[PDB]
Amino acid sequence: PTYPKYLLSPETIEALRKPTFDVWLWEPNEMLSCLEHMYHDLGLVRDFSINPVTLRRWLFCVHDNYRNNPFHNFRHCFCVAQMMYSMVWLCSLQEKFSQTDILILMTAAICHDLDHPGYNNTYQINARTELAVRYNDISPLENHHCAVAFQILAEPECNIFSNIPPDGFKQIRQGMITLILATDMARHAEIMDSFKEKMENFDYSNEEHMTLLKMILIKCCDISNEVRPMEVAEPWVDCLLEEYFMQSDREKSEGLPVAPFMDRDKVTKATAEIGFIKFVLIPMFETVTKLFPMVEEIMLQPLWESRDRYEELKRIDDAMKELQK
Amino acid sequence: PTYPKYLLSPETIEALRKPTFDVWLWEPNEMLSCLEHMYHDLGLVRDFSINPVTLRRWLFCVHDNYRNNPFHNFRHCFCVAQMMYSMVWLCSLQEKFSQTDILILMTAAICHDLDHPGYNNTYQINARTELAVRYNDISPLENHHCAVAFQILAEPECNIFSNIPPDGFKQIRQGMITLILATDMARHAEIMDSFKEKMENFDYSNEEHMTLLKMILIKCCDISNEVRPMEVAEPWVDCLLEEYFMQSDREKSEGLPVAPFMDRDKVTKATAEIGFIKFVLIPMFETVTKLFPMVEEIMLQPLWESRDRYEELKRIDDAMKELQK
Ligand SMILES: C[C@H](Cc1nc(=O)c2cnn(-c3ccccc3Cl)c2[nH]1)C(F)(F)F
Ligand SMILES: C[C@H](Cc1nc(=O)c2cnn(-c3ccccc3Cl)c2[nH]1)C(F)(F)F
Ligand SMILES: [Mg+2]
Ligand SMILES: [Mg+2]
Ligand SMILES: [Zn+2]
Ligand SMILES: [Zn+2]
Numbered sequence: 001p002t003y004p005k006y007l008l009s010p011e012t013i014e015a016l017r018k019p020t021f022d023v024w025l026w027e028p029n030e031m032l033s034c035l036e037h038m039y040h041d042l043g044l045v046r047d048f049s050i051n052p053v054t055l056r057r058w059l060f061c062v063h064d065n066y067r068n069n070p071f072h073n074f075r076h077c078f079c080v081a082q083m084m085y086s087m088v089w090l091c092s093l094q095e096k097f098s099q100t101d102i103l104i105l106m107t108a109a110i111c112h113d114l115d116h117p118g119y120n121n122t123y124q125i126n127a128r129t130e131l132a133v134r135y136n137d138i139s140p141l142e143n144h145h146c147a148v149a150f151q152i153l154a155e156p157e158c159n160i161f162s163n164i165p166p167d168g169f170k171q172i173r174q175g176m177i178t179l180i181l182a183t184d185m186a187r188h189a190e191i192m193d194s195f196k197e198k199m200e201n202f203d204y205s206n207e208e209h210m211t212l213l214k215m216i217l218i219k220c221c222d223i224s225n226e227v228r229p230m231e232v233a234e235p236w237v238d239c240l241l242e243e244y245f246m247q248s249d250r251e252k253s254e255g256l257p258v259a260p261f262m263d264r265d266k267v268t269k270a271t272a273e274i275g276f277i278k279f280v281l282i283p284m285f286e287t288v289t290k291l292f293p294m295v296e297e298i299m300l301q302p303l304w305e306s307r308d309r310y311e312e313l314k315r316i317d318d319a320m321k322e323l324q325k
Numbered sequence: 326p327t328y329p330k331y332l333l334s335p336e337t338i339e340a341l342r343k344p345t346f347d348v349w350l351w352e353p354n355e356m357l358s359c360l361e362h363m364y365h366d367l368g369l370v371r372d373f374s375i376n377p378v379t380l381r382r383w384l385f386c387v388h389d390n391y392r393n394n395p396f397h398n399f400r401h402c403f404c405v406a407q408m409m410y411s412m413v414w415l416c417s418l419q420e421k422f423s424q425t426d427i428l429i430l431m432t433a434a435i436c437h438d439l440d441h442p443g444y445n446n447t448y449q450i451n452a453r454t455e456l457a458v459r460y461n462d463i464s465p466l467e468n469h470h471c472a473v474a475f476q477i478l479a480e481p482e483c484n485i486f487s488n489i490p491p492d493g494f495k496q497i498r499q500g501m502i503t504l505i506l507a508t509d510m511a512r513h514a515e516i517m518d519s520f521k522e523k524m525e526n527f528d529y530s531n532e533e534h535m536t537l538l539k540m541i542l543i544k545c546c547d548i549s550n551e552v553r554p555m556e557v558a559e560p561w562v563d564c565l566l567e568e569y570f571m572q573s574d575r576e577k578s579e580g581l582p583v584a585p586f587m588d589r590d591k592v593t594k595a596t597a598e599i600g601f602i603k604f605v606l607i608p609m610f611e612t613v614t615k616l617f618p619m620v621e622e623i624m625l626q627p628l629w630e631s632r633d634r635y636e637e638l639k640r641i642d643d644a645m646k647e648l649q650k
Contacts, residue, residue: 001389007382010482033378040377052365052377053358056332064326157335 006033013037019086019224019298022232023079031078032059035110038085042106047099049163058158065114065148070242072116077109079228079236083221084109090299091292096204100168101214104175107160108218111149112180116141119247121186126256139184146180175214182215183222188280191215196287216288226277226306227285227299233306237273270313277307331358338362344411344623345554348404356403357384360435363410367431372424374488383483390439390473395567397441402434404561408546408553409434415624416617421529422539425493429500430539432485434546436474437505441466444572446511451581464509471505500539507540508547513605516540521612541613551602551631552610552624558631562598593646595639602632 003009006029008016015021016034026034039045039055066074084105088094094102117124117131124132124140131140150173152158161169182191195212203209225236244262251258260266282303289295328334331354333341340346341359351359364370364380391399409430413419419427442449442456449457449465456465475498478484486494507516520537528534550561569587576583585591607628614621 001386003382003385007385008378013378037378046371053333053335053338053362057328060328060332061326 005030008033008037016082017086017089019083019090019227019302020229020232021082021086023075023082023228024232024235026078028063028074031075032056032063035059035078035081038081038106042085042088042094042102043099044103044106048103048161048168050160051162054158054162055160058152058160059110061152061155061158062110062114062149065152067116067118069116069118070246071236071239072113072118072243076236077111077113079225080112080218080221081106081109083224083227084218087217087221090294097210100171101175101210104172104179105214105217107149107172108176108179109221111152111176112142112145112183112218112222114145114148114152116145118243119250121184122259123247123251123256126251127254139181139186142181142184146177149176149180175211178211179214179218183219188219191219192284192287199287199290202291213291216284220284220288223281224299226273226281227302229302230306230309237269241267241269268314268317270310270317273310274307274314277303277310282307330355333358333362341407342411342414344408344415344549344552345557346407346411347557348400348407348553349557349560351403353388353399356400357381357388360384360403360406363406363431367410367413367419367427368424369428369431373428373486373493375485376487379483379485379487383477383485384435386477386480386483387435387439390477392441392443394441394443395571396561396564397438397443397568401561402436402438404550405437405543405546406431406434408549409542412542412546415619422535425496426500426535426539429497429504430542432474432497433501433504433543436477436501437467437470437508437543437547439470439473439477441470443568444575446509447584448572448576448581451576452579464506464511467506467509471502474501474505503536504539504543508544513544516544517609517612524612524615527616538616541609545609545613548606549624551598551606552627554627555631555634562594566592566594593639593642595635595642598635599632599639602628602635607632 005027008030012034016037036056036059039050040052044050045052045055062077063074066072066077088102088105093105097105119127121132121139121141123129125137129140131144134140135143153161156162161172164172191212195216198206198209198212202213226233244267245264248258248262248264250256261272282300285295285300285303289300330352333355337355337359341362348356361381361384364375365377369375370377370380387402388399391397391402413427413430418430422430444452446457446464446466448454450462454465456469459465460468478486481487486497489497516537520541523531523534523537527538550558552558569592570589573583573587573589586597607625610620610625610628614625
């Protein structure tokens with residue numbers, strides 16, 4: 001007949017494997033079925049004896065623990081995991097990674113921003129929040145996301161890892177913590193350097209090489225919005241700014257220091273994006289391309305187009321402002 | 326948190342294995358989830374590579390094809406499948422049957438009453454309905470349930486067998502057809518005789534022996550209401566009498582004969598149930614017990630209690646009907 005929304009159609013199931021997937025077309029229920037499909041499809045349910053019902057509860061609990069922020073919400077979570085999913089396919093990651101690593105990658109992606117408050121680490125630290133005090137100023141947000149992820153997993157009804165022997169649990173947990181903590185942008189240069197270092201003569205047998213690679217992969221997915229089609233990507237930039245502005249406005253009010261890139265009276269969307277794409281996104285994806293050449297066509301291409309589009313957009317903006325004076 | 330109904334709680338999943346499960350507490354969605362869980366739990370999704378999403382679309386389509394009769398509806402379908410599932414564990418059937426047999430048993434239980442009109446074969450035949458004409462008075466309803474079952478599986482989106490090699494499909498199809506046709510009570514004596522004949526020296530390696538055992542298994546589940554707790558079983562009896570009175574009514578105003586056990590003025594519920602329990606249910610489960618001894622305490626027991634309760638009800642009922650005269 002005509003099946004409910006939570007029963008993905010075979011077209012959806014197919015499109016889900018590509019970075020082109022339009023993440024705005026679905027409601028939480030549908031997004032949850034997509035995430036559920038990914039675990040079955042990647043063979044994770046199979047290889048780790050994941051109780052199919054526990055998987056649904058775990059995903060619903062994860063969903064319940066994401067806040068209603070303009071950017072750091074459940075839909076962003078879906079994007080990251082969905083891009084990680086596309087990359088497993090595009091790069092044929094199952095050929096180079098064990099199932100244990102694929103599991104670490106996917107679960108970390110889904111949990112990386114759990115219970116995000118909507119104010120970055122700088123705000124937590126300057127305002128001396130409970131999180132900043134709890135984590136001694138060390139990546140308070142990322143530490144918290146990871147802690148909430150394991151508190152959820154510690155709930156028996158949500159423990160998708162219930163049938164994994166303790167030695168495997170330890171390995172997975174250590175892997176997730178490492179990846180989630182690797183998403184704090186304050187460590188971007190640091191991580192990128194370590195990767196590029198190993199990249200000179202990459203060894204898929206070297207555990208430290210693989211760890212860095214996995215860190216780079218989750219970082220890619222986390223800030224992979226601009227890799228998506230222009231219509232899918234643009235709205236996210238507005239959501240992010242909306243969140244940054246809310247923070248700066250609050251910092252202005254409470255008398256805390258304000259970061260220029262988050263100040264309403266200073267940031268112009270186009271100009272800012274150009275710098276981000278040009279000096280953060282493109283460079284990072286170029287390094288990944290050396291290992292997975294198919295990335296250039298599938299992900300570097302859209303990044304270049306985005307850079308161009310925004311560079312043009314700025315010219316139009318400058319001329320417009322130049323004319324108003 | 327507090328999950329939606331379609332997410333079975335771990336308590337429900339546990340209960341689903343026992344014949345004491347309360348089949349009335351659930352809405353189609355929860356029942357659909359239960360059936361899905363059964364296919365994963367028994368290892369069918371795993372061993373036959375059933376696409377987990379197709380499994381759900383299929384269950385939804387099956388549901389859509391059951392009518393809103395008072396007895397022969399989707400909830401009856403859930404009962405039979407659930408009793409079958411319970412029997413698998415009670416009798417440790419996976420030690421005696423292959424996964425293909427289990428798949429045959431489970432899928433046949435679920436499909437055995439598809440698109441039932443609410444009027445039995447005797448009516449179809451006597452009224453010379455389209456079905457009786459189509460199937461030449463040979464188990465018309467059962468033949469139809471079968472046909473519908475395979476028209477459904479013919480739809481790609483609902484074909485839970487799409488990944489089974491053709492030889493496996495044929496074996497499964499043959500098996501399901503045999504079990505569904507075996508539910509026609511007109512053949513009850515025939516089948517019980519043939520089974521008891523083989524029972525004189527049962528051979529688990531003899532294919533004919535196993536065929537009859539599976540037919541007895543599905544017949545057992547099909548009419549196993551009285552095995553369930555009294556609170557669960559009695560409402561089913563009333564639901565059936567509702568259809569029976571609907572038929573006997575229509576048969577009288579059409580000039581077609583009426584089966585005494587369906588005649589309101591002869592079918593004192595208690596007297597009819599006592600007979601059914603004593604000469605159909607008990608004898609059947611009795612022979613099955615000789616093969617699986619544990620069946621006596623778990624299913625033959627409640628049948629005795631049930632037979633005894635209806636006998637008490639009969640006394641009080643006849644007394645009150647004497648005043649009505
Ligand atoms: C600041 C944004 C661009 C941007 N997009 C991100 O996803 C992101 C993640 N972290 N950061 C970030 C945060 C703080 C400091 C530096 C950066 Cl790079 C980001 N900056 C814009 F240019 F306005 F569009
Ligand atoms: C129809 C009832 C007897 C009876 N009791 C059941 O619990 C039960 C379960 N399934 N069936 C059943 C349903 C459809 C066709 C045949 C049967 Cl046998 C039953 N029939 C009576 F005769 F009125 F007392
Ligand atoms: Mg984060
Ligand atoms: Mg029937
Ligand atoms: Zn993020
Ligand atoms: Zn039936």
